[PDB]
Amino acid sequence: YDLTTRIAHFLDRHLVFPLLEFLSVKEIYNEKELLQGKLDLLSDTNMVDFAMDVYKNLYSDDIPHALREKRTTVVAQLKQLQAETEPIVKHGFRQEYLDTLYRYAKFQYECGNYSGAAEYLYFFRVLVPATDRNALSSLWGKLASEILMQNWDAAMEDLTRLKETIDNNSVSSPLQSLQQRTWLIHWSLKGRDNIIDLFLYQPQYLNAIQTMCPHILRYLTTAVITNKDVRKRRQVLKDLVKVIQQESYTYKDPITEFVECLYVNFDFDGAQKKLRECESVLVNDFFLVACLEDFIENARLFIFETFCRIHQCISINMLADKLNMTPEEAERWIVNLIRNARLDAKIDSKLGHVVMGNXXXXXXXXXXXXXXXXXXXXXXXXXX
Amino acid sequence: LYQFNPAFFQTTVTAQILLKALTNLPHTDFTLCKCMIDQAHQEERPIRQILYLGDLLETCHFQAFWQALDENMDLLEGITGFEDSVRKFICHVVGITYQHIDRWLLAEMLGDLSDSQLKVWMSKYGWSADEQIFICXXXXXXXXXXXXXXXXX
Amino acid sequence: YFSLVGLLRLHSLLGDYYQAIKVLENIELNKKSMYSRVPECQVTTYYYVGFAYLMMRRYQDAIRVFANILLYIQRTKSMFQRTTYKYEMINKQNEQMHALLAIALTMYPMRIDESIHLQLREKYGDKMLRMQKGDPQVYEELFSYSCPKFLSEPFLQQLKVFSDEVQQQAQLSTIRSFLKLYTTMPVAKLAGFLDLTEQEFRIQLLVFKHKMKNLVWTSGISALDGEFQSXXXXXXXXXXXXXXXXXXXXXXXX
Fold this sequence. Notes:
The structure is cut from a larger assembly and holds chains A (about 375 residues), B (about 150 residues) and C (about 250 residues). In chain A, about 70% of the residues lie in helices and about 0% in strands. Chain A has helices at about 5-10, 15, 20-25, 30-40, 50-55, 65-90, 95-110, 115-120, 130-150, 150-165, 175-190, 195-200, 215-225, 235-240, 245-250, 255-265, 270-280, 290-310, 315-320, 325-340, 360-384; strands spanning about 315, 345-350, 355. Chain A has a three-stranded antiparallel β-sheet. In chain A, helix 8 packs antiparallel against helix 9, helix 12 packs across helix 13 and helix 17 packs antiparallel against helix 18. Chain A is flat. Chain B is an all-alpha fold and about 150 residues long. Chain B has ten helices and no strands. The N and C termini of chain B lie far apart (about 65 Å). The relative contact order of chain B is 0.09. Chain C contains 13 helices and two strands; from the N terminus they run ααααααααααβααβα. Chains in contact: A-C, B-C. Chains B and C meet through helix 3, helix 7 and helix 10 of B and helix 12 and helix 13 of C. The PDB classes it as translation. The entry lists the keywords translation. The entry is titled "Model of the human eIF3 PCI-MPN octamer docked into the 43S EM map". Chain A is Eukaryotic translation initiation factor 3 subunit E. Organism of A: Homo sapiens.
């Protein structure tokens, strides 16, 4: 995939630069695109720490003019805001003070000092004229800064403060924004079964701010598909396949759409080949990178379970040959899966035979029949 | 008498009563005795230890029993045949829970016996080694007719 | 008879189990005198019977006596409704007795009934859920939190003995519930299921131990292979047909 479009695609500044730096650090130190674009993008802004890093090797050559100007303009801005806030604390007006807290927050954020951006951001608590706009926007900010400082605990916290807050409007997406933040927190924190529930829930039809439109499609999709323990047939069917709204996000990244159609349709080989194909790109995703190996393995386990429950006796060697993936690798994967107790697969690699089992038998059916009879009797008693 | 007249509680006699009760498993003797001793006394040494040993026997953890059993325990010395009585219970359980059993395993469960001693117990219950020690219409129709009639009605 | 029952209860509180049981055995007397004299006395007798059953290994006898004192869910799952005639304090005592019976009641059959019992309390419903889960960790915690209920005298119940015994029986039931029905079973599947039980080594031991109990049957256990193997039918069918007819009869009669 081209970087220009990816970097272009995400509105957020952190995504714009942090993603470039991730792609650069994440895959190859040598490649130009991560470093050139990050350099040029950083030089458009007030953070010299990021700029200093760019100056360092693997980064665009250091320029004296860029740093001195940024640095000095900052000194000036800090003095200005300091005074203005002094004066605002001393006209006795809440709105001005709130703006100052917000403006110190903005200043610190662009300057790249995140702790302070957070502190002065939430300092606007007391001076909030109203919880819904003064307070919920404070939430959106703590959410941005917390995501960027990598505390997703705090993200959930201000998500519950925001969505717990009494005034809620159905029309506003902010519902959308908060869903996205929560989804992201769950995803960063077996399958969560929360992340997907969140991402699948709605589309604002307005820019995510937090989540790439493709990002929501892929995160929702993969998290769901991997939720064997949590997911209902509906969860595969109800909340993804049948879900018309989510279709919008899905049509954005069609490779993922077909991946899910493949899985739902029982062609797990196709599905897993798509996944193998995308793996290298998905390892470039700043939020997804850490969970990739887990989600794919879970999907594979689910596929095995679908194969495994439907056949009493399996020719393992044939399956490995006919798998479309190497037989030895498949056997190794099964061996890894089994100890976890994910699969009740009865397997000897050497035999190549696999066997899974879900008067005694006859008694079983008889027992069930008796059970039903009991229920019927109970109903009769109730009627009486 | 001990429960009703606490000052007479005798540790040795109580311990011997409990140990002899165990020699009478699978019968309920051991459980009945426990019903006759309050918590405070069951928690005292060596009653606590004896109940623990009994627990291993009741739950049929024979290897654990022999291991935990301080063979040179004072109270056991005077209790004639204690060890063999325990073995009778074990063979009672074995006769019920095994079809075939490893010769080495049986000796372990009986208290790590020599092959010669094991032979004594196999002989006692008639067990022998194999490959190993060898251890071990019209009315209906009428009923349907009636049932059918009832259903129809 | 009332004096005997009270005396027996006193002995049980401060008294040995067997003598109290003998007193209970003498104790039962015609229902009718008790019914004429008061509503409560019969309930007290039922409670005493339930206590004896609880002391007794069988929970069946106590299950009947308790239901008669208080309404209980019947075989065939029909509601049993008790009379409200007895004096309100006596009725409260009866409700307490019913709460006690739940412990006996769960052992008797099934399954998740608390309909007569108030929905809001998590003390009994939570316990029912934990049993349903089949995982001890929740069960153990339920005892730990509601430690206070068990204690309610302290010497009389110094060690919580009965509750612990009951829980250990309760833990075993779920494993038997798979109840074999498989001619030959992979060891690994058994290990995964037995692993959940607190002892890791139990399956080598825990599985063999289950066979000794005889609740569940294991075939080929201790084998070199290491994989477990696992007119009468007509009678069963006939039995079912009978039940169906019975249900129909009740419907017609109704």
